[PDB]
């Protein structure tokens, strides 16, 4: 019924909350009791992380109330990350920065369960360019500390991290990312 319930939540998104005959938090809370048992199938996690977070109803409480428990039962798949990078699109809707903070915390917390981590690593710059905004730096730094491979240490990224360190503080998250970039091709040095 969850697949039916989540498509109902999508209908709850194709229309307003006011126009709905029933509350979202009632049906999404039945889904939440389900999450206390089993939160989101790979397809379910994908879709409910896709439509609930791109632009639609997805209240910065409601989208967060799900996002606290929107992780995966078996594993998170590539198509989950794909168009939530189009939630990382970060635009007119943007799933505004608080839900972005919980979203990047989602990825940091569940970086261990992806079938193909290489696919997200191939998406390295999409999150690396998200390091410039202040609110996601403490969490994007962790994510790229988890995503970093040698192919992602191009010298322009090294200079961008140095620019971030000079403009912003000596924050230990930037220091951790710098430690990785020193562990790889040493175009930068720091201890």
């Amino acid at each position: 019924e969850e697949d039916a319930l989540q498509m109902a939540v999508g209908y709850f998104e194709k229309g307003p909350i006011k126009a709905s005959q029933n509350k979202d938090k009632t049906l999404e809370k039945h889904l939440k009791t389900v999450e206390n048992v089993a939160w989101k199938n790979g397809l379910a996690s994908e879709e409910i992380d896709i439509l609930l977070n791109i632009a639609l109803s997805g209240k910065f409480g409601n989208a967060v109330n799900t996002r606290i428990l929107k992780c995966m039962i078996p594993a998170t798949v590539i198509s989950e990350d794909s168009v939530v990078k189009a939630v990382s699109w970060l635009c007119v809707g943007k799933c505004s920065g608080s839900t972005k903070v919980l979203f990047y915390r989602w990825l940091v917390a569940m970086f261990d369960f992806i079938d193909r981590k290489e696919q997200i690593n191939l998406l390295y710059g999409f999150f690396f360019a998200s390091l410039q905004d202040d609110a996601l730096c403490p969490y994007v730094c962790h994510l790229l500390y988890l995503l970093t491979k040698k192919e992602n240490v191009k010298p322009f990224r090294v200079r961008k991290l140095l620019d971030l360190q000079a403009k912003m503080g000596m924050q230990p998250h930037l220091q951790a990312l710098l430690s990785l970039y020193k562990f790889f091709a040493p175009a930068l040095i720091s201890v």
Partner: protein
């Protein structure tokens, strides 16, 4: 041959077979080829703190700019934990043609305030060249002079990139007396400084130090008293020079200087300490003083 030769060398050294090195009096070393007069003259009257430097793996005297950048970016990063690093081959600080050319490491701070001026030299050190493979460019001597903090940072960088290790070279009072004797045996003129021997008695509660500073010409005439075989100074001749000092000090102050230890032997050739801050190089005998110093660094490495 590639290692077993070094094992046989270690066997010979540990055997301790009749060591007394009858050494040639440091001959006037006319400055070989280039030896940048400004650079070498800047390198003479500087108090080098000696270290023993194991051979550098995968070193090349072509990639000086790359190492300069790699170390400059490391030193200023140790400040994160204004500075320029100029690796400079010296081109002439070598005893034989096959020795590796000595090269500098200077922490240049705006102007040329050389904070640290490191110095690796391998002169007359062919007891190490013929035992190490080609990949290692061996420079047994390392010369600090900058603060101990910067030395203990560039040494770490060198360990990290070259697998070379810096044991602080400590000249024992035996080697110190040897060099104090061959430097008053030299054929120099216009003695720059008095021949001072800073003794330091081994008293447990107190730490009295003695500066048995002799007039440099007066010590040369005292050396000629105990110098009989020319060309080479023996261990007995060195001991007799030192015992004439002993019998001129215990004669005067009734305290047996031979019961004390040398800590510093200033001479017109080159001052020399014990604890490491050793080699001031007053005169341009530095290819001979450095020859002795490298021969001593082999002793520590090998």
């Amino acid at each position: 041959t590639p290692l077993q030769k070094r094992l046989e060398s270690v066997r010979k050294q540990s055997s301790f077979i009749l060591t007394p090195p009858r050494r040639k009096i440091p001959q006037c070393s006319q400055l070989q080829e280039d030896v940048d007069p400004q650079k070498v003259a800047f390198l003479l009257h500087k108090q080098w703190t000696l270290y023993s430097l194991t051979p550098l793996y995968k070193f090349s005297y072509s990639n000086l700019k790359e190492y300069s950048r790699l170390l400059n970016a490391f030193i200023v990063a140790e400040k994160q934990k204004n500075i320029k690093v100029i690796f400079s081959t010296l081109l002439g600080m070598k005893g034989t043609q096959r020795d590796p050319e000595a090269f500098l490491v200077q922490i240049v701070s705006r102007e040329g305030k050389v904070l640290w001026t490191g110095w690796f030299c391998c002169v007359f050190g062919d007891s190490l060249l013929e035992t190490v493979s080609e990949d290692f460019t061996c420079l047994p001597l390392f010369l600090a002079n900058g603060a101990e903090s910067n030395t203990a940072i560039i040494g770490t960088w060198f360990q990290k990139t070259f697998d070379c290790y810096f044991s602080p070279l400590a000249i024992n009072a035996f080697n110190l007396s040897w060099m104090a004797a061959m430097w008053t045996a030299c054929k120099m003129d216009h003695y720059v400084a008095t021949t001072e021997f800073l003794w330091s008695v081994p008293c447990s509660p107190q730490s009295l130090d003695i500066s048995f500073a002799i007039h440099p010409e007066d010590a040369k005439a005292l050396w000629d008293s105990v110098h009989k075989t020319p060309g080479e100074v023996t261990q007995e001749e060195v001991d007799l020079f030192m015992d004439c000092l002993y019998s001129h000090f215990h004669r005067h102050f009734k305290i047996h200087l031979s019961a004390t230890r040398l800590v510093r032997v200033s001479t017109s050739v080159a001052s020399a300490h014990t604890d490491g801050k050793i080699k001031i190089l007053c005169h341009k005998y530095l290819i001979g003083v450095l020859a002795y110093l490298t021969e001593l660094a082999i002793f520590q490495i090998e």
